[PDB]
Design a protein around this ligand. Structure first.
Ligand SMILES: Nc1ncnc2c1ncn2[C@@H]1O[C@H](COP(=O)(O)O)[C@@H](O)[C@H]1O
Ligand SMILES: Nc1ncnc2c1ncn2[C@@H]1O[C@H](COP(=O)(O)O)[C@@H](O)[C@H]1O
Lengths: 593, 590, 102
């Protein structure tokens, strides 16, 4: 009588079915972050595990977030508006005054320009999904809808009329109207698709760093009892130094028991709605330096160095940050190292590395008339706001720039021009910003023992180049003198012209590498790094360690996602359970019909 | 200037991304009653708002189609038991544990019924929706709420709960071919008690008639200056096949006897807190359903010396010329005029009362008086099932068509019994024992709506023969006069079948299985109205209704428990949004 | 204010459980339910209190049991006898006027 066996099969069958209707169900979801930078617009495709629980709705497991594809670098959002202003306002718009009111006639023409770009991003996104997902995964991803987060960093923020915000209204209309033939349910809203500031970018990069490295989590790393008797809990978070194209961000946890001066403030991630209340309280020093971006620092450096009598003689600017044998036209225009060995300087106003700073330093537009010191800071850098744009960016009494390959002079000038200028640029007081004005002020008044991660392609190139030539050891841990001695050797290299093109030839027959558009001025980045490390060493509190990272390894050893602001943007929406459930699932793609 | 066209274009696009968006949703209510299972298709307007999710506008709930009557859920279980337990399962002890060997066979029975219901639901959606409505309806998902009422309540083993697990599984796997995303969960698809049916019917009535809303009709200030607000709700009298429900608002400024309780809709999680407090008198009587009252009426009338003489039971609620064999078995009026009484234990009208009034049932074991209340109503729990339902010393039931004698027997057997059947005590009920007690001790001024197929057929029959005026508004003597005349009709056999021939040659109608015992319903109506009239407080008005017309005069939905079941879910905004939209049909992926 | 026999039983049950250190914010055991939600309870002791006018019997409802629909579990949080921070307490509460000493 194996009747008992077949009774239990029936009992277990019913239990299996009961468990299935009472337990949580997992489903895969795709998430898209469109990185709309200054000179490019690129799609970023993510996957996440959603959990659907009886009477609780649907949520994302934040630890499941993973990048499955980075797309093609298309034209920057700036290009859409520049071309629209070239056709309808006249190619003369960058110099001549334009009545913005008249441009409302060309709204569907602006819509068409943005449509071209959005179709290309949509095409590229669909391509990445189709190539990375199996048929089962595609069924889950197509049914759930695909939230889209388009965020413009730099480039677009520089227009100062109605165009910018109107463009955003148009991009969202295009995102919410995808072609039905592919079946991917792309959608957005004004909370997910919007421009972000340099300061907000830093906070997102801080969140990304801390999530990927698993330092950020609901469970506190350490708790402490305050003066009143209430338990105060925190995570052991790492700080971040992110050097981008248009700005550099420095975001790190506020030192425990530190009281900042009244004029500056710790940015509280819970108060700013970047982290939910269920996460340990996070108070950070947040700083975004507009003159410390790869592009903006290059422009300002030339403007200031080449207006200094020690460096400028008879129309020749002797640049200590450029290699011996290198020469270029005297301007902050975009440099192309030609196979010939020579340098081509793009003289277009649109391609000038000083353009963001020179538009910021004008009589016609901002803070210049407001605070006397603001106009005083522009004139100091030989950019008088009363002059037209071309004249403001022009390096006067200067014809050529010759490299002298003197690292110590390069460090001294980076210190004097970019890191500790006599008159800092106005302090930014937005919610995302602590309100600091210089690097010294940060490390003099608000230094911390939290570890620091150095990020940005240019920063990592500076270190890796020295390691590649065996000037820096692979175990390099951030010692200043070690870096300075390594860079002093590399930076004294000669530009040699060979049949295969120009080369950076190292002293004492150490070797060579090809000279190119990306590496010709990298000694300025090595000098910036030396200067940052010195200011960090001079702090009362020292970071427990300093590391240079491009990626953070995951549980399997493979990076789950890349460093930057993208992960942080997903998290600040996704971690707010109720609001995310309402927007992504209740409203969803069905909100578009 | 073409600039204003551009400025308007951006402002309209901006409004489009800041404003709420409306979208249509279909909702399904499967009514799994004792004799039948029928789908009910509804339409609703959803509103999607930035940072606020998606909700249903309750005023938009509209019935678009009520489908076919398929077999009762009870048939699934009876057939599976006849096969796997044996033909004598209703009368012999069964080892329920051995039946765990036949779970796929139970699933197989449920699957045939679910496929028929699914196909019918889809046919209704396809016949009522335009191509644009279909797009919206298909996108949002289709919540399904299967609720069983009578029929499955009395099995008392693991079977019913197991059947429900299988039904939700079937609902959660619809045919992908039609594009309709049907889905359910254990909160939507579940059995409901008779007292719960009453509360949902009371909610349906008050919602459709626009009495139930967030804004109160009247308030009273308490000792602490706090407003104690209420709506002006109507009560309901619902006579179904298996039970009769009475639900009405508790008379204002009153407190019930301490041994009974007012049912609070907000406390019972039926209405959200944003709705004024609704305290109700809630009553469900198994013995007052069409099928059960018919069985018990015969059981008690045919055991009384005044009616039973020489093996002949003289029934005053039956027509002169009508005759049937002595049993509470289902009556089939045959073409030849004769009555065919089904002797099957399964077809006995007394079977649900016999199941309640059994030693097996723990319900009669909790309370000591319960067994006595059963026995004194001629349903002896000590007797075996067949003996328990049998009418002794009786061969024939003869109709006498005496309406007043019928009313007086309805009073003594059904409305005001000397000793009622055990009172129903559950979270959804007040604990009253009889109709007489309801109106003697807890009468209200609230208007009353009389509903149910049989109740309305009884009023319509008298109106169609022009015995009652069309504008009849509930007068007891007008009703008793019309019913008295109709109930004195003679049953005549004709070549075309049996007819009810009205006196003074004032008409005729076909005699059938559905209308032969209709005079008992008329007597129940007179008896109920007499009790409501004698109350300290009388309803402001009394109406017989089947549906409530919308603001456009067009029919909005039907009266009954279905709309109320939808509301007790949709009105809890956050819970609804999570269940219908966040989890949705996508919860069934893989 | 006056209190009834049934309220007196609930009050006596709370007294006993507080004094014996059974009632408190710290649950004695927490059970992961069918949905995967941990449901915390104190290990409460029942009371038989025989007074002059009535006898009260109050004890926690058996874990995973379904009472007949004709009777109900008294929830202390719902009756505002215990705050929300205290683990949920469902009791069988009875007061018999005929079991008192007098
Ligand atoms: N290998 C590299 N050498 C020099 N500059 C780079 C390199 N990779 C990226 N950059 C620059 O560093 C900045 C940040 O780059 P990324 O971290 O790749 O977004 C931009 O101005 C890039 O053009
Ligand atoms: N036209 C009718 N004539 C007589 N009895 C009816 C009629 N319609 C329904 N009934 C009875 O009323 C009960 C409830 O019907 P309903 O409201 O349609 O569920 C049924 O179970 C039948 O016993």
């Amino acid at each position: 009588a194996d009747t008992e066996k077949r009774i239990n099969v029936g009992k277990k069958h019913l239990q299996t079915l009961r468990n299935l209707e009472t337990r949580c169900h997992d489903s895969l979801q795709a998430l898209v972050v469109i990185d709309a930078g200054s000179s490019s617009t690129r799609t970023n495709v993510f996957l996440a595990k959603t959990r659907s629980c009886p009477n609780k709705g649907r949520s994302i497991d934040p630890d499941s977030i993973q990048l499955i594809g980075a797309g093609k670098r298309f034209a920057g959002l700036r290009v859409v508006l520049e071309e629209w202003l070239d056709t309808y306002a006249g190619k003369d718009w960058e110099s001549r005054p334009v009545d913005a009111r008249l441009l409302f006639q060309y709204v569907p023409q602006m819509h068409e320009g943005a449509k071209k770009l959005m179709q290309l991003l949509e095409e590229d996104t669909v391509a990445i999904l189709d190539s990375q997902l199996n048929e089962k995964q595609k069924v889950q991803v197509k049914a759930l809808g695909i939230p889209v987060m388009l965020c413009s960093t730099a480039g677009v923020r520089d227009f100062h009329e109605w165009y910018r915000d109107a463009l955003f209204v148009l991009l969202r209309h295009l995102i919410n109207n995808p072609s039905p033939a592919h079946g991917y349910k792309f959608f957005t809203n004004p909370f997910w698709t919007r421009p972000i500031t340099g300061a907000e970018e830093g906070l997102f990069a801080f969140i990304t760093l801390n999530h990927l490295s698993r330092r950020l989590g609901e469970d506190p790393a350490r708790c402490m009892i305050d003066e009143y008797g209430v338990k105060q809990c925190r995570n052991d978070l790492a700080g971040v130094v992110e050097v981008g194209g248009a700005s550099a961000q420095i975001v790190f946890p506020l030192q425990e028991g530190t009281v900042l001066p009244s004029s500056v403030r710790a940015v509280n991630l819970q108060r700013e709605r970047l982290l939910p209340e269920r996460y340990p309280s996070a108070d950070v020093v947040s700083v975004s330096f507009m003159q410390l971006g790869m592009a903006s620092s290059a422009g300002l450096f030339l403007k200031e160095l080449c207006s200094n009598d020690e460096f400028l003689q008879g129309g020749i600017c002797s640049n200590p940050c450029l290699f011996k044998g290198f020469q270029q036209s005297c301007s902050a225009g975009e440099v192309e190292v030609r196979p010939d060995g020579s340098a081509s300087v793009n003289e277009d106003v649109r391609k000038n590395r000083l353009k963001p700073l020179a538009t910021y330093c004008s009589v016609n537009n901002p803070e210049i008339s407001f605070k006397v010191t603001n106009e005083m800071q522009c004139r100091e850098n030989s950019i008088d706001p009363t002059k037209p744009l071309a004249e403001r960016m022009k390096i006067e009494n200067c014809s050529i720039i010759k490299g002298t390959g003197n690292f110590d002079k390069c460090v001294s000038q980076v210190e004097s021009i970019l890191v500790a200028p006599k008159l800092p640029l106005p302090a930014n007081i937005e919610a995302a910003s602590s309100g600091f004005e210089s690097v010294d002020q940060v490390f003099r008044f608000a230094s911390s023992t939290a570890p620091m991660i150095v990020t940005g392609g240019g920063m990592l190139a500076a270190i890796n180049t020295l390691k590649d030539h065996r000037l820096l050891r692979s175990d390099f841990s951030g010692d200043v003198e070690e870096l300075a001695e390594a860079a002093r050797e590399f930076c004294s290299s000669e530009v040699i012209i060979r049949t295969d093109g120009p080369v950076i030839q190292l002293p004492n027959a150490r070797g060579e590498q090809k000279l190119n558009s990306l590496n010709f001025d990298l000694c300025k980045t090595m000098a910036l790094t030396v200067s940052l490390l010195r200011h960090m060493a001079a702090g009362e509190n020292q970071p427990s360690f300093i590391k240079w990272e491009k990626s953070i390894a995951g549980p399997d050893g493979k990076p789950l996602a890349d460093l930057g602001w993208q992960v942080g943007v997903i998290l600040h929406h996704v971690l707010f359970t109720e609001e995310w459930g309402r927007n992504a699932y209740e409203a969803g793609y069905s909100h578009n019909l």
